[PDB]
Amino acid sequence: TVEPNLHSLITSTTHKWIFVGGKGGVGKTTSSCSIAIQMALSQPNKQFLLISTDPAHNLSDAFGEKFGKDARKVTGMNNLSCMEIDPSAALKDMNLADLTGSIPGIDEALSFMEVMKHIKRQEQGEGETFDTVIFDTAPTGHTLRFLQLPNTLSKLLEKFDISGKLNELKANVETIRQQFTDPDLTTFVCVCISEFLSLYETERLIQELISYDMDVNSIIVNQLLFAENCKRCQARWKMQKKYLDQIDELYEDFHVVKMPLCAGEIRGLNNLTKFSQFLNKEYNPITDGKVIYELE
Amino acid sequence: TVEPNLHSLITSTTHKWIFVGGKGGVGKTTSSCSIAIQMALSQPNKQFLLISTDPAHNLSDAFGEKFGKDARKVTGMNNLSCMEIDPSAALKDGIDEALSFMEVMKHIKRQEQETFDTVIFDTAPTGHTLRFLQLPNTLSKLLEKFGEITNKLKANVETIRQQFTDPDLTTFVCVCISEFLSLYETERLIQELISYDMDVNSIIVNQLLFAENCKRCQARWKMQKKYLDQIDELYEDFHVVKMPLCAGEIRGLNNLTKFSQFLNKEYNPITDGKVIYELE
Amino acid sequence: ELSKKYLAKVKERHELKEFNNSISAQDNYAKWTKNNRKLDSLDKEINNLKDEIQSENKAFQA
Amino acid sequence: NELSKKYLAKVKERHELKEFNNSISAQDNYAKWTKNNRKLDSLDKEINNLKDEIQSENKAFQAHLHK
Ligand SMILES: [Zn+2]
Numbered sequence: 033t034v035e036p037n038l039h040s041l042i043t044s045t046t047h048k049w050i051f052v053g054g055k056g057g058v059g060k061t062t063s064s065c066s067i068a069i070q071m072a073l074s075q076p077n078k079q080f081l082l083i084s085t086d087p088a089h090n091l092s093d094a095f096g097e098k099f100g101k102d103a104r105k106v107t108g109m110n111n112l113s114c115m116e117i118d119p120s121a122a123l124k125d126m127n128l129a130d131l132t133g134s135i136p137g138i139d140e141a142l143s144f145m146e147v148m149k150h151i152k153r154q155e156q157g158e159g160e161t162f163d164t165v166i167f168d169t170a171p172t173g174h175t176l177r178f179l180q181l182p183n184t185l186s187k188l189l190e191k192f193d194i195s196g197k198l199n200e201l202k203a204n205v206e207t208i209r210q211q212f213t214d215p216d217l218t219t220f221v222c223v224c225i226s227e228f229l230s231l232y233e234t235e236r237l238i239q240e241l242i243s244y245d246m247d248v249n250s251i252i253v254n255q256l257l258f259a260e261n262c263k264r265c266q267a268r269w270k271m272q273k274k275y276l277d278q279i280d281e282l283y284e285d286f287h288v289v290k291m292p293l294c295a296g297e298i299r300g301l302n303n304l305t306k307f308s309q310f311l312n313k314e315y316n317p318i319t320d321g322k323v324i325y326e327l328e
Numbered sequence: 329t330v331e332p333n334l335h336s337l338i339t340s341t342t343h344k345w346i347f348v349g350g351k352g353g354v355g356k357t358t359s360s361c362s363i364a365i366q367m368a369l370s371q372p373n374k375q376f377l378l379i380s381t382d383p384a385h386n387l388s389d390a391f392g393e394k395f396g397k398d399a400r401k402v403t404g405m406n407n408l409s410c411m412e413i414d415p416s417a418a419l420k421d422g423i424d425e426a427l428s429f430m431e432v433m434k435h436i437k438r439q440e441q442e443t444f445d446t447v448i449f450d451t452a453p454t455g456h457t458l459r460f461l462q463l464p465n466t467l468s469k470l471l472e473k474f475g476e477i478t479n480k481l482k483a484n485v486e487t488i489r490q491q492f493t494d495p496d497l498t499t500f501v502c503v504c505i506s507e508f509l510s511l512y513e514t515e516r517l518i519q520e521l522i523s524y525d526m527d528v529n530s531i532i533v534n535q536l537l538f539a540e541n542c543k544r545c546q547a548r549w550k551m552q553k554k555y556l557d558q559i560d561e562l563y564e565d566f567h568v569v570k571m572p573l574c575a576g577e578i579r580g581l582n583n584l585t586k587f588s589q590f591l592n593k594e595y596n597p598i599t600d601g602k603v604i605y606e607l608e
Numbered sequence: 609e610l611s612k613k614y615l616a617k618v619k620e621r622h623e624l625k626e627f628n629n630s631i632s633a634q635d636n637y638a639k640w641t642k643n644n645r646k647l648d649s650l651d652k653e654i655n656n657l658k659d660e661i662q663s664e665n666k667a668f669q670a
Numbered sequence: 671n672e673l674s675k676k677y678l679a680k681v682k683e684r685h686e687l688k689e690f691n692n693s694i695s696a697q698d699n700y701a702k703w704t705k706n707n708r709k710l711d712s713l714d715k716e717i718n719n720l721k722d723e724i725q726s727e728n729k730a731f732q733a734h735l736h737k
Pocket of ligand 1: 264542544
């Protein structure tokens with residue numbers, strides 16, 4: 033059977049790349065911090081990096097300290113560091129928009145190659161290399177489009193200063209793909225809430241991911257009430273569970289982990305650590321309720 | 329100077345077609361019933377028809393009585409009737425949508441042959457009901473290309489196109505809740521509608537808490553208002569009407585009428601709160 | 609042979625759609641979504657047979 | 671190419687807008703963000719229209735060329 037938690041992931045020694053994403057007020061950034069905190073704690077021997085391309089600068093806001101292009105150890109953790117970067121800025125600095133955009137996946141590839149440069153620059157200079165990276169992906173756009181590039185890139189090469197850089201990109205991207213398509217090296221974690229639109233958007237995300245040969249076995253469902261353990265909340269929960277029952281039927285072989293709603297916003301290492309444990313061991317509204325209330 | 333309610337619409341004597349739609353658990357069907365109830369009460373002289381292509385058969389569920397292909401007066405109302413039809417079935421009986429829609433128009437005129445003054449469409453939550461709306465453009469282009477053959481060897485639909493692009497005859501009412509996805513989906517709906525030259529000035533925002541008048545609810549409301557403030561900036565010239573969340577599901581004429589008044593006169597969490605609680 | 613198997617999948621795809629639009633994605637979301645997956649699968653097949661069909665034609669000139 | 675010099679000009683603008691809109695949070699900025707989305711669609715529409723004028727212009731020249 034398939035456990036409704038991330039434990040196998042959280043304790044995984046093979047994975048070098050964990051992608052976390054979802055669209056909406058779904059609580060993406062908090063999930064990314066939880067996942068990164070859990071792995072870090074569970075694997076003190078390995079050094080982790082959490083990076084966010086989200087423009088809103090959510091990491092600094094979540095941990096309560098300032099992060100940037102320069103990797104910093106999050107205060108209170110000796111194995112976890114954070115980076116917040118703007119890939120569009122990184123492009124604008126260096127930089128035919130018609131010629132680029134005309135083909136799908138080129139614009140994203142150039143944006144991504146900038147974040148890879150930043151990472152290896154943080155590893156070289158300091159001398160501290162990261163064992164596993166957690167990407168908090170932008171809530172909008174399609175970030176992984178560059179994964180189907182080589183296929184559509186080598187197909188447009190056969191028929192057809194410029195030629196070189198293109199084939200070079202094809203090469204780099206294929207080298208990456210060899211990583212991102214290995215389920216033991218790389219996986220994607222979807223974040224949704226139980227409501228129709230989020231669940232639809234989440235399905236399409238999964239499909240797109242499968243089309244890139246990206247491994248996705250994991251879905252985090254946030255903001256669940258578990259009200260039966262306020263007449264308004266009670267009703268809302270009745271709906272959340274309506275879809276919950278069907279999510280479980282839709283992805284059977286997925287780890288679909290159910291996360292409790294917390295009033296107000298979760299911030300700071302302490303609250304995050306206390307909350308992030310429900311990714312490793314499934315939250316139980318009966319026993320764990322006290323933990324949730326004390327965060328308020 | 330644009331009121332956050334539907335009163336102008338509800339009391340409108342010009343409108344023959346009101347379309348209501350939105351995707352999700354947004355509360356579409358309840359809005360459609362409210363709008364229809366309000367007009368009916370406010371205009372006792374006119375006869376109204378509320379029809380739903382939603383497969384779930386939500387009308388019968390909302391009013392608590394059985395409806396079907398045959399128009400029935402909703403018990404308790406002498407000016408309002410209901411139809412629930414499946415355009416697929418009728419079908420078997422922009423081109424795909426057009427053929428589906430022409431079937432509902434046939435049903436309507438068949439029920440009249442008592443004529444209805446104004447029709448309220450509860451549109452399907454999925455797909456696009458109005459690709460037909462784009463059709464009288466596309467269908468008249470079928471007739472422009474058709475008549476092109478005659479010279480070698482319509483106005484009936486044209487006046488329909490004119491009626492659908494006439495803001496005084498026809499309008500669309502969007503239903504959303506204040507959350508990102510619903511609001512995005514609602515924007516795109518509006519744009520698509522504008523592209524058909526369909527008039528949409530009206531957005532109903534459902535399931536609002538107004539909590540400040542439960543720590544969980546309080547927080548949720550803080551978000552709802554976050555987006556609410558921006559909705560107001562996004563569509564200024566729209567009537568964006570804010571509807572209170574009601575615990576449990578609203579059903580039956582009574583509860584519906586009591587709830588539907590907040591479309592005509594904006595709900596006030598301060599004064600109107602008692603009305604909401606008594607429904608729960 | 610081939611050209612018949614195409615026309616039959618276009619029929620199947622059609623029948624599925626007509627059905628999926630007879631059910632509520634809200635209430636039935638599990639089933640509904642499964643059906644959506646199948647529809648995409650068929651659209652991928654139909655557009656595979658169109659290719660095969662027009663291909664063995666263009667090549668038939670020999 | 672009074673026409674063509676526009677196609678590149680508006681393709682540049684469209685590009686710059688996108689780069690910007692992706693520097694802002696649709697969650698926090700949703701009012702502005704959406705406005706920008708509207709403009710982007712407006713430009714894409716002007717882009718495809720120009721693309722078609724060219725196709726229509728060059729087909730008109732090659733007609734005069736045949737005649
Ligand atoms: Zn509550």
